[PDB]
Amino acid sequence: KYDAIPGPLGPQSASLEGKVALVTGAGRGIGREMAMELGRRGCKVIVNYANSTESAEEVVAAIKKNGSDAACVKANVGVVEDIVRMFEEAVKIFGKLDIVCSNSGVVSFGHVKDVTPEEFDRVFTINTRGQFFVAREAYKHLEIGGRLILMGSITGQAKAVPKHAVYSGSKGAIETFARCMAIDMADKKITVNVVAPGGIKTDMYHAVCREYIPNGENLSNEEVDEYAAVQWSPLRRVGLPIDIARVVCFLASNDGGWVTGKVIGIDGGACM
Amino acid sequence: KYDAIPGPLGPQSASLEGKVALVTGAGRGIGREMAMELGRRGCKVIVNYANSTESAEEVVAAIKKNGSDAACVKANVGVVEDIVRMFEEAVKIFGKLDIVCSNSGVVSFGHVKDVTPEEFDRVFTINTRGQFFVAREAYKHLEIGGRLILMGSITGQAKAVPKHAVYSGSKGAIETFARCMAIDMADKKITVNVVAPGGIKTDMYHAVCREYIPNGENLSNEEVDEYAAVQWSPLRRVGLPIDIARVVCFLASNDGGWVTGKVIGIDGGACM
Amino acid sequence: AVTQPRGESKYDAIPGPLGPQSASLEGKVALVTGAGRGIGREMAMELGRRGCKVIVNYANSTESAEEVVAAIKKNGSDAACVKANVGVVEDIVRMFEEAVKIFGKLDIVCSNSGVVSFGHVKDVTPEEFDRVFTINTRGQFFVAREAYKHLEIGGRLILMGSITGQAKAVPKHAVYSGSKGAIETFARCMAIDMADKKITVNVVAPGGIKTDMYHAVCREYIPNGENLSNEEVDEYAAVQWSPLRRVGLPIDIARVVCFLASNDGGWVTGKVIGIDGGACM
Amino acid sequence: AVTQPRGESKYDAIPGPLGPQSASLEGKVALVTGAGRGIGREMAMELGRRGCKVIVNYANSTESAEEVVAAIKKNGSDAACVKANVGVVEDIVRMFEEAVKIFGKLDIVCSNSGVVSFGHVKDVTPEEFDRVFTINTRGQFFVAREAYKHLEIGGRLILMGSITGQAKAVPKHAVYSGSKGAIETFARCMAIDMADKKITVNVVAPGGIKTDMYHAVCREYIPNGENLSNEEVDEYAAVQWSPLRRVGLPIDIARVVCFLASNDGGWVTGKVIGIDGGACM
Ligand SMILES: NC(=O)C1=CN([C@@H]2O[C@H](COP(=O)(O)OP(=O)(O)OC[C@H]3O[C@@H](n4cnc5c(N)ncnc54)[C@H](OP(=O)(O)O)[C@@H]3O)[C@@H](O)[C@H]2O)C=CC1
Ligand SMILES: NC(=O)C1=CN([C@@H]2O[C@H](COP(=O)(O)OP(=O)(O)OC[C@H]3O[C@@H](n4cnc5c(N)ncnc54)[C@H](OP(=O)(O)O)[C@@H]3O)[C@@H](O)[C@H]2O)C=CC1
Ligand SMILES: NC(=O)C1=CN([C@@H]2O[C@H](COP(=O)(O)OP(=O)(O)OC[C@H]3O[C@@H](n4cnc5c(N)ncnc54)[C@H](OP(=O)(O)O)[C@@H]3O)[C@@H](O)[C@H]2O)C=CC1
Ligand SMILES: NC(=O)C1=CN([C@@H]2O[C@H](COP(=O)(O)OP(=O)(O)OC[C@H]3O[C@@H](n4cnc5c(N)ncnc54)[C@H](OP(=O)(O)O)[C@@H]3O)[C@@H](O)[C@H]2O)C=CC1
């Protein structure tokens, strides 16, 4: 019985046709591209957002235009009650849930000496606690054989980024969550993995990329990209949202069936 | 220029149509399935073998039957001259090389006190040195934007397998090779990664699976599979060659473009 | 080509003494959180035996904390206890202010206080998640913050992680494991910032260690271990979790902490030190 | 429910002495490969200072080896040099037999000998690969094998790795890095086997350390570093590779080796200990 092949042989194993995915914080940035790409691959997508209402509506319309159904659901991951409600709403929209991408997140910088309890809590509540409860509700609502992909960062393991303990720590915790949740969620045949991107061009990158660059405060946007391209990748280019979306789709497919409890680094070979 | 999208948006990014791949030790086991699956996804495949002539010929025929071209080439990876010859022959057969899967390998068990220089050398010459020179020749012959996938094992990082220092060490070195080669080979835009499978049902698994099981010398083949399924995976099943082939195809496609210098564990969440 | 042969420069200066004196903690002052019992208690005891004056922090175990202080004094060192709950930042701030007043300085800070929890991810409540993270992660973070502010230049900060931070086979453990996993990242990041005061920051990651905590939940780490006797539990821990065939003890951890706290640990910073007798979990 | 409260059992026995004596190496015998110079020389020197009688192995540096032996004796401990090339298994076997004849027993073995190499993967020849792997990997493996056979019950085996085993940004370094990365796996796997004689097996992973090797190739780790003066190279190493802002020294590694070799390292086995001042390479 253990000789049975799981899923189809050939390219069909990469297909996401007919699947239903939910992506947190899909109104913009990496989450937006995850939504777009899952859609291009045949998924109906639930676009979650907390603040970016108009942007979320635009993503939903873009997904439909590409040939897949989509809908948006407002929910703040810092509020568990919101997460619970979002999932209940989500399953009524398309009738089921096959894939959940926990992507929502915020960044923070500051020397450990200057960190306040309020800032620590702000970051942990969204990045760690928020992902945990999105994971909890995903387990309850996911189809047998489903998928849960959490959002980490190269910072979980990075050794040279100063004034970054809070954000880095909020992300490192996700790697442990993946290993432990992969055990529990396997009782519904759900795989649990964490993607760990390097710097990726989004609103977050624009806001804080210079903080990762010694003496980079006065660099132009052009110099910033040149630095990210040369310093963080032997491939000599900047990371883009699609670079992450592609890996998420692999994990979400039958091709990622034997990949569970893992951290997948997607940083172009960066050393940080 | 840093805003340019690398490759196609959508499912086409997972396509291997028109690519040419070379797989070492493709006459049987994991290498055979890699060759078969790469062929199913559109690759013309060079089926390398060292001893399994008839099996290699069967794989080539099956690939052609499935709709793709293939050819087998003999080469013992323990002889660098053989590796050099194989790559020269490969490019003559198909004109180019896009993907190289360094798969060939041998297993070994023995308490450290009993390991002989001959056994150590036998294992390292094939598993470590062999992979290193297959990688060197791959770099020389690969198309710009090519792919190199090396074969590691859960043993590179495993913490409870006794009498296994030689084999485990030969595989652990591969993880470092992936990180270092990713830097060098990036000058030709080639990504370099290592897949690390847990136990997979093959001839190798049949020969030594019991060695990974305390007091498993007398277990029936049925009990061995049951042990592997329950002990090594929360998903409760045994790993199969297709589980690995699928991940190799992902890495070999445009979807794996930003994944370089990484170790991808494919063990169903095993703890060993 | 730069042909000049190697030369002794300013970077050739030896940090600290050569020989066994490099392992000495004589004259140092250490603060250990949750030192009234368990691993924290042994850290305090051993640090005391090696010459440190110790600040024994406790949150509830008042009597045990007084016992530890008395034992350290009896052994030949000075000690004092300070009550503070790490789930309250104001308590941590006050603890450190009182601490430096006691002996005049702080050389070593061992962030040890913690709580354990088990539960399938599906059953975890926000209150339980918060209970664990507030003590194990947030608590250690602010103990670290205050430690940085009060520590002598060249000081030492040792955080308490666990084998669970990296463990792959413990079911129903994501909350506790995640709270400890975050500590490994903190060690790497804090080692950078705190180096501006020449302070090293590392995290010790113990496997199972015989304490009140181990007593309470060791069976949770053992498949079908609910009905195992205390003796059977120890035998299991000894054989299953260590090729060395014995159970981990508080002294096993305290010894490594003393190494990191000494001059011998000067070049070890931003690291995770596993102390589990070679366990695979 | 098992209601019997925690009590002492056979597994509660304290391994070794409580207090500072646990760090003592007094009366121990240690063997260090490649101890005529560099890191190996300092391991031998420091081990000697802490009370060990030392077997100083060398392959070529005869005079240097003799100087180390004389210095250890002058410092108060006995020592003797033994010539053996780790690329020849027969030499290794002979070296261990001679070592036990000299001092009667062997408590600690430090596998330190190594060579470095640089080259883009495209240019690496089988001879170069074999040259590096025969000494750094195969050599260390057979030194470990013989060490297991001759070491005292409760002994110590410390292998020499490098930050390169895990490094992510050093170009043209696959061969050397790989030869060192294999050592980390060896530590995990040998810790299991060797535990049958209560021997702990660990690997130390240094960052750049000022020695003849560092002097020879440090510029290779520095982009556009070919024309930097010796002073400039040290300044770069100090600032780029450590938040602590100084260069790593042989004594930095020797101290950690002494800790691992002592009773304090008793519960530390199958581990990789990074000693690089918090470097990111
Ligand atoms: N960009 C980079 O370089 C990297 C990013 N990451 C991680 O990837 C994820 C996305 O990053 P990126 O796209 O750059 O981020 P942006 O800052 O561009 O936006 C991120 C998303 O997080 C959402 N979000 C924030 N708070 C909440 C909340 N309370 N509830 C629900 N959703 C929320 C935002 O939605 P809204 O508009 O509605 O507020 C937005 O959709 C994050 O978790 C980030 O930490 C990891 C590595 C690198
Ligand atoms: N099965 C498992 O559980 C796991 C396997 N792996 C690794 O995956 C790879 C394949 O494993 P698996 O299929 O199980 O192995 P098998 O033993 O079934 O077959 C292995 C392959 O290695 C080839 N090979 C052996 N020696 C040479 C040589 N000198 N030159 C060229 N090719 C050679 C063999 O070809 P030929 O017949 O022609 O000699 C064969 O094709 C190996 O590297 C293995 O270590 C890693 C983790 C787990
Ligand atoms: N035992 C084991 O096997 C392992 C333990 N660890 C970690 O080591 C540390 C100590 O474990 P162990 O000694 O076994 O634990 P115990 O349960 O025996 O007691 C731990 C200590 O934590 C203290 N503490 C708890 N909450 C607080 C608080 N809010 N404020 C201040 N102090 C507090 C307790 O003091 P009080 O009585 O005053 O409340 C007690 O002194 C923990 O962080 C634990 O997670 C890691 C790996 C293994
Ligand atoms: N210096 C650094 O920055 C770092 C060094 N390391 C590792 O630490 C170890 C020592 O480095 P370092 O002291 O700088 O090296 P050096 O080049 O200064 O000398 C190293 C030692 O290796 C010995 N050796 C070389 N070949 C053999 C052989 N075939 N048989 C026996 N002994 C041999 C040499 O002895 P002889 O003179 O007799 O030939 C010498 O004693 C090496 O394994 C190295 O890879 C790791 C990280 C960093």
Ligand SMILES: O=C1CCc2cccc3c2N1CC3
């Ligand atoms: O999480 C990371 C990791 C690395 C990195 C480099 C540049 C800019 C940004 C990042 N982020 C968020 C924004």
Ligand SMILES: O=C1CCc2cccc3c2N1CC3
């Ligand atoms: O390399 C590994 C890892 C794990 C494992 C489990 C069972 C059988 C076999 C393995 N192998 C080879 C054969």
Ligand SMILES: O=C1CCc2cccc3c2N1CC3
């Ligand atoms: O944190 C850990 C890791 C391993 C372990 C094994 C047994 C008992 C206990 C543990 N703990 C806490 C109590």
Ligand SMILES: O=C1CCc2cccc3c2N1CC3
């Ligand atoms: O092995 C390593 C790692 C790092 C490093 C930095 C500088 C100089 C040298 C090293 N070596 C050998 C010589």
